[PDB]
Scaffold this active site. Structure first.
Site, mmCIF file in Angstrom:
data_model
loop_
_atom_site.group_PDB
_atom_site.id
_atom_site.type_symbol
_atom_site.label_atom_id
_atom_site.label_comp_id
_atom_site.label_asym_id
_atom_site.label_seq_id
_atom_site.Cartn_x
_atom_site.Cartn_y
_atom_site.Cartn_z
ATOM 1 N N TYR B 174 0.778 -0.937 -0.092
ATOM 2 C CA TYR B 174 0.248 -0.094 0.275
ATOM 3 C C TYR B 174 0.956 0.943 0.328
ATOM 4 O O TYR B 174 2.349 1.129 0.388
ATOM 5 C CB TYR B 174 -0.950 -0.103 1.349
ATOM 6 C CG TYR B 174 -2.166 -0.860 0.421
ATOM 7 C CD1 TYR B 174 -2.658 -1.052 -0.815
ATOM 8 C CD2 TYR B 174 -2.284 -1.865 1.550
ATOM 9 C CE1 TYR B 174 -3.507 -1.879 -0.881
ATOM 10 C CE2 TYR B 174 -3.614 -2.851 1.177
ATOM 11 C CZ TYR B 174 -3.625 -2.712 -0.220
ATOM 12 O OH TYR B 174 -4.957 -3.531 0.154
ATOM 13 N N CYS B 364 -16.514 -17.815 9.286
ATOM 14 C CA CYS B 364 -15.393 -20.052 9.419
ATOM 15 C C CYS B 364 -15.831 -21.110 9.519
ATOM 16 O O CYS B 364 -16.687 -21.205 9.919
ATOM 17 C CB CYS B 364 -14.893 -18.774 10.824
ATOM 18 S SG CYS B 364 -13.511 -20.142 11.739
HETATM 19 S S1 SF4 Z 1 -8.354 -20.278 7.836
HETATM 20 FE FE1 SF4 Z 1 -9.312 -20.469 10.726
HETATM 21 S S2 SF4 Z 1 -10.411 -18.447 10.646
HETATM 22 FE FE2 SF4 Z 1 -10.015 -18.785 8.028
HETATM 23 S S3 SF4 Z 1 -11.896 -20.161 7.877
HETATM 24 FE FE3 SF4 Z 1 -10.026 -21.384 8.766
HETATM 25 S S4 SF4 Z 1 -10.541 -21.852 10.306
HETATM 26 FE FE4 SF4 Z 1 -11.444 -19.803 10.746
#
Ligand code: SF4
Ligand SMILES: Cc1cc2nc3c(=O)[nH]c(=O)nc-3n(C[C@H](O)[C@H](O)[C@H](O)COP(=O)(O)O)c2cc1C
Ligand SMILES: Cc1cc2nc3c(=O)[nH]c(=O)nc-3n(C[C@H](O)[C@H](O)[C@H](O)COP(=O)(O)O)c2cc1C
Ligand SMILES: Nc1ncnc2c1ncn2[C@@H]1O[C@H](COP(=O)(O)OP(=O)(O)O)[C@@H](O)[C@H]1O
Ligand SMILES: Nc1ncnc2c1ncn2[C@@H]1O[C@H](COP(=O)(O)OP(=O)(O)O)[C@@H](O)[C@H]1O
Ligand code: SF4
EC number: 1.5.8.2
Lengths: 729, 729
Positions: B174, B364
């Site tokens: 950035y 998530c």
């Molecule tokens: S990388 Fe981790 S915080 Fe992101 S959706 Fe997957 S389990 Fe969840």
């Protein structure tokens, strides 16, 4: 005065319990507002009402959270909050004597439901051919009753919101059509198999909606009469006409389209492939069997074409989407006979591209006020008149310069527009000469016609074309109060591109075997048989030059470091473009770029050629194994389409000599369009429109704030709801 | 109790005029809320405050309309309306004793400005390598002064909003980083060339920000210490460490990252490629020369790893993004010694995928409440306790079933979980065995651990694995009050795909030369030398199977009718995945699909092979010239990855026999997860979590409404502003 032959377009027509004042109708179309931007929704639709359009419709309107188009933005009629927001639009449209309509939508698996996370339901379980990771649940009899109820409830809320027209949306391969089309419907019960069975879901829904609000609202249905895929899906003279006969008594008006969702560019025909009235062969088939008013879009902008379809019995109403965006006042202009004031849509589909990208507001190449009516207060036909007598010099008559000129003239300023070119248009004069882009010239035809006319209203204003290049001294001594530099941009000549931001060794368009898009279009420089187009741009240039050269007999290979014609996915031109390139035998080398050029040959490499494993190897060393995919390919001529740069030399000299401005009574100099930064034609046009509207502000170079339509913390969307955090424990 | 070795993680640390209660810090990260969804923003950040995180930061926050990320969603601190909306978050975070921070952002050409339509400015004119159609204007000295002023004004607004930490964001390529990096900066004046000149813009901005709010706020700077491209961009031991020495006296804390914007998956490392602590080699170099608190993310979930970096002197604070999304209460759990209650992030990057897509809220895979805290009132650690003694039978222990079991048990219901499989996890057990996906097993490890623990709290609940398949009769006679069918989905065996929605002639996975993903993962059926993978899915299956088979010595060719690994662009796995496939010599045949299959050979065609011109030729005839690109390719084994279908036979039988439910005392049966419709693992998990939370509702099959954060017509976003349409005339 209006030509008498156009009188028919102004006769009223009855649609159920409602009466359209004239034959100009705005069919449902997205604008990036939905029920989330009530001001934008109401202003955009109301200016059209003021402009004479008989009826204004919202875009597809979701009847339930399980038909959520996020990331794309649709209208929503889920609850009372939506009723409130949408009413702002119906109230404002009624203010100017027009009808308001809503397009009830349920998308099946085509709706990704990224916000709601709900499960969409469909006739059979399938993964959408549009949203490939989205699947639906096969509906059982109760699922069917429940979804039908969603339509009824939505119709009821629509009446509460003040809508006069309620659609049961069955075009673009959405729910009702999914039941009708064997491509989706594999059911063996009473909702599948025979046409009567396949038509059942739609017929029942119409009947239920009509029963619920039919006495207060006109019941319209939008129907994709032919999927334009041949046998296997809907064909107009097979299932198409038969369905119309079946549903005819239930509907007050037929709104017809063609095509599916994956390729709806077949409906919203880009000027690149389709002319005005391209849909006629299919649309007329409906009038042939219906006893109700019929309308079918076809990018109608010409009054002569409009009267032809009506008198020939092809349709009874003139439905438009894009023509209404480009010119909200089209009906009024026709009524008053002001034909030369009509801002004709160029069929670029840039308005559509914003909806498709998902989330951003609509913009229009012709109408810089589209989407700006509410937030900036820009009316397309009303301009604030200046109280002073400032004269403005505009250097450059391309999309940005010519628009700034036009707006300033409409505002009463004295304008001096100059260019070295012989005609208004700038780079657009070359672009419209590319294969299939002829209608894009309307952008410059409109400004030419308008500037010419406006010159007559102020003898101090002047148009000086075919002149010698303006210099810093010429500008300083011109005697204008303010100056607008709109000098444009040129295509890179040294290989400079977005991947490296550096020139490519050996690239030089002055060499006999290398060319830029400009040199190709001028048609002077010789082009050899084997042509390689090096590309780093995601829009129309590379594909268009490929088509031009291939049809002229050259052997074309496109080496592209970015996704070829990516932006064309959004304008809906991509499918037919790829087909065109395929029939012309254009070879595509995607995922490759160039490391160096020599006479007659260039070295290319795969952009994914470096090692996959990242390891810290200290300074001076790359953290991945070296890319060893390099190979040389030969060419007779290499066409460079690597990027553009602003032609801002004049501006730079003027800025260097800023101390001299005051002495010469120059109040300010502004940089606009491609000369500030290479933009899409629509935005170049917008910059010109903006400095013109804001010429009297403290700093016209930077835009003043616009009204933002974002929720205010403390105010719940649900009337009487609790905005505070409440955990269910 | 907490292991003593972990005590250091709870020592306070001084950052400028502020004190962090402990060493747990949530760095800035998008969640799809910005300043547009204040409820989501405040709830998501505050639950973490309650969970023990010392500081919570917003995502990248735009300092001015000319740095607008639309279509992607960022926070914004442009006016008073934003201050009001963002204060909701700071107040709520303070209520739990944590600090609040904001990441001041200006993106240069990387911001497409689709909403504002403004022109971005940068050190030199360039077309963003990320947003390839977005160009910026080269800044002159007054431009530089004005942009620095934007930062100052945003910083002052931030303080008014109640932020304790203010960042000058210089990571992910950035603005500040663009001046420092030769890749973007081609200037020849005092802001380019030497390092001192390249660092000038950042140093000046830090100084002005510090001067404006440094007495009230801690001034932090986020810096991409190495672009991981090698010479040509920023290298840690060259410009990296030297800039830290230069700016050290100005900053209160260093927040370090690696990589750029086009490939920020190098920062947000996916478990497929990077392990916990993967950034250490670069991050440690900063501590080596700084006298201020340093923190550097690395997907830290293990406390043992957390103490290692602190004691070894690699960092002073534990910065997390993803780990905090998967478990908002991670700090409290470590503090109380409840190590086995930690919901570990699997590094799938699906949360990130939502931001990248542009517009949708974050979700998530591990935490079904992420994004649901405010709108649904779902707290990740608090469950409403049942007042009755209903027993629930759950058939299927995959992501959806196991999550439903976990939540019901936490709510106090008697639960009976059963599966034919020997372990909890369902299809995830096979998926986590694909190359690089080992850490995905944490999803099932967590649930296995929690269910096992919850069984102890109620002796009537039961876990029955390795059982014979449940039949309809078995379910009817089980004696449970409510039943949840979570039987999953399987890959298609007959070629059925999203393109045609029909089987492919000759496709049959029972044949010796054809296989499904399950058959390949079981490792029982023989696979020949030359393998062709026929794909119609846009996520991980095809690429992963290709990697698995190539490393095992097979010659692999992927014929793909959709964009191969498209969804991986969003999870940031795409770049490294393509490099991996390239190293393995996997051949890709994009834009092609299959018309028919035979033993040892299949007929493929180009999906763009039909004629480009559409002509109405009546019924029975296709409107385009016929596709004649068909050709045959051979194979020893063909792997079918054309789509999935729900395994809902048991459900269908139970529904058919619905009249028998009442007599068997069954109050209700619900369909969840893949069995309802194939979903992403995150959504499968969500369905289980939802029926569990809404088991007492009128119809648990369908979600109850959630709080919507959309503007209410009649309320202006600007305090005291006018919401009505006002034209400037
Ligand atoms: S990388 Fe981790 S915080 Fe992101 S959706 Fe997957 S389990 Fe969840
Ligand atoms: C910006 C835009 C978005 C569209 N969105 C919709 C929509 O919400 N619902 C719908 O039924 N049709 C949609 N259409 C299709 C139009 O209603 C119309 O069928 C198409 O643009 C052709 O009409 P025209 O040629 O007059 O523009 C959209 C068209 C445009 C221009
Ligand atoms: C959902 C998400 C969005 C992100 N958005 C930002 C952002 O707005 N600003 C920023 O500086 N970093 C952003 N990041 C990067 C994270 O701050 C962090 O550098 C990255 O995820 C690595 O930390 P972790 O390994 O603890 O997740 C984002 C990451 C995630 C998970
Ligand atoms: N010094 C100059 N004097 C006069 N006209 C100029 C000068 N420099 C450039 N022009 C003209 O400016 C116009 C720029 O138009 P164009 O490239 O279409 O830009 P935009 O898209 O910003 O409108 C061109 O017609 C070019 O001939
Ligand atoms: N009739 C049945 N009886 C018991 N378990 C079943 C039955 N049919 C399928 N299953 C199990 O249900 C589970 C489905 O899990 P999965 O495919 O992971 O679905 P989801 O992703 O929806 O949780 C599998 O473990 C499968 O063995
Ligand atoms: S953006 Fe283009 S296609 Fe759309 S209304 Fe405007 S001129 Fe027409």
């Amino acid at each position: 005065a209006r030509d008498p032959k156009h009188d028919i377009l102004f006769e009223p027509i009855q649609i159920g319990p409602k009466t359209l004042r004239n034959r100009f109708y705005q069919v449902p179309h997205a604008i990036g507002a939905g029920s989330d931007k009530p001001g934008f929704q109401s202003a955009h639709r109301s200016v059209k009402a003021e402009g004479g359009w008989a009826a204004l419709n919202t875009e597809y309107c979701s009847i339930n959270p399980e038909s959520d188009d996020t990331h794309r933005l649709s209208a929503r009629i889920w609850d009372e909050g939506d009723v409130r927001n949408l009413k702002a639009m119906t109230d404002e449209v009624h203010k100017y004597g027009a009808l308001a309509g809503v397009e009830l939508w349920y998308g099946g698996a085509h709706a990704p439901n990224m916000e709601s996370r709900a499960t969409p339901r469909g006739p059979s379980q399938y993964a959408s051919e549009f949203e490939t990771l989205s699947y639906c649940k096969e509906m059982d009899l109760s699922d069917i009753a429940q979804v039908q109820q969603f339509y009824v409830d939505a119709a009821k809320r629509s009446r509460d919101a003040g809508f006069d027209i309620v659609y049961v949306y069955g075009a673009h391969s959405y729910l009702p059509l999914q039941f009708l089309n064997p491509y989706y419907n594999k059911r063996t019960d009473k909702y599948g198999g025979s046409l009567e069975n396949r038509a059942r879901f739609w017929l029942e829904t119409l009947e239920k909606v009509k029963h619920a609000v039919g006495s207060d609202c006109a019941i319209a249905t939008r129907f994709g009469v032919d999927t334009v895929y041949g046998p296997g899906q809907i064909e107009a003279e097979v299932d198409g006409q038969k369905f119309v006969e079946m549903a005819d008594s239930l509907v007050d008006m037929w709104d017809i389209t063609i095509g599916d969702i994956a390729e709806w560019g077949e409906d919203a025909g880009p000027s690149r492939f389709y002319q005005q009235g391209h849909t006629i062969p299919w649309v007329k088939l409906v009038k042939q069997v219906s006893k109700k008013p019929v309308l079918g879009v076809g990018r109608y902008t010409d009054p002569e074409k409009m009267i032809e379809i009506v008198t020939k019995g092809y349709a009874d109403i003139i439905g438009c989407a894009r023509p209404s965006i480009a010119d909200p006042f089209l009906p009024q202009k026709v009524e008053q006979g002001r034909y030369d004031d009509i801002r004709v849509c160029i069929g670029c589909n840039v308005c559509i591209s914003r909806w498709e990208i998902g989330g951003p507001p609509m913009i229009c190449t012709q109408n810089a006020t589209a989407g700006e009516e509410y937030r900036r207060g820009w009316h397309p036909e009303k301009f604030r008149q200046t109280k002073n007598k400032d004269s403005v010099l505009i250097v450059g008559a391309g999309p940005s310069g010519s628009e700034a000129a036009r707006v300033l003239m409409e505002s009463g300023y004295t304008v001096h527009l100059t260019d070295t070119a012989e005609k208004i248009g700038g780079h657009l004069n070359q672009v419209a000469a590319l294969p299939g882009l002829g209608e894009w010239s309307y952008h410059r035809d409109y400004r030419e016609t308008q500037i010419t006319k406006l010159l007559k209203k102020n003898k101090e204003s002047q148009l000086a074309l075919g002149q010698k290049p303006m210099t810093a001294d010429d500008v300083l001594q011109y005697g204008a109060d303010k100056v607008i530099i709109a000098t444009g941009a040129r295509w890179n000549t040294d290989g400079t591109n977005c991947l490296t931001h550096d020139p490519i060794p050996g690239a030089d368009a002055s060499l006999p075997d290398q060319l830029t898009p400009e040199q190709v279009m001028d048609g002077k420089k010789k082009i050899g048989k084997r042509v390689v187009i090096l590309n780093a741009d995601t829009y129309f240039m590379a594909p268009s030059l490929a088509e031009k050269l291939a049809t002229a007999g050259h052997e074309v290979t496109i080496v592209s470091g970015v996704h070829l014609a990516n932006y064309m996915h959004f304008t809906l031109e991509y499918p037919n473009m790829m087909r065109r390139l395929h029939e012309l035998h254009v070879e595509e080398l995607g995922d490759h770029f160039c490391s160096r050029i020599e006479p007659g040959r260039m070295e290319i490499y795969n952009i994914w050629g470096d090692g996959s494993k990242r390891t810290y190897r200290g300074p001076g060393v790359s953290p991945r194994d070296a890319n060893t995919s390099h190979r040389w390919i030969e060419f007779d001529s290499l066409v460079l389409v690597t990027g553009r740069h602003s032609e801002c030399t004049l501006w730079n000299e003027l800025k260097a000599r800023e101390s001299e401005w005051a002495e010469n009574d120059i109040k300010g100099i502004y940089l606009i369009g491609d000369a500030e930064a290479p933009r899409l034609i629509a935005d170049a046009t917008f910059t010109g429109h903006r400095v013109a509207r804001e010429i009297e502000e403290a700093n016209p170079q930077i835009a003043i704030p616009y009204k933002r339509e974002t929720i205010a913390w403390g105010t719940p969307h649900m009337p009487g709801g609790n905005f505070k955090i409440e955990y269910k424990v």
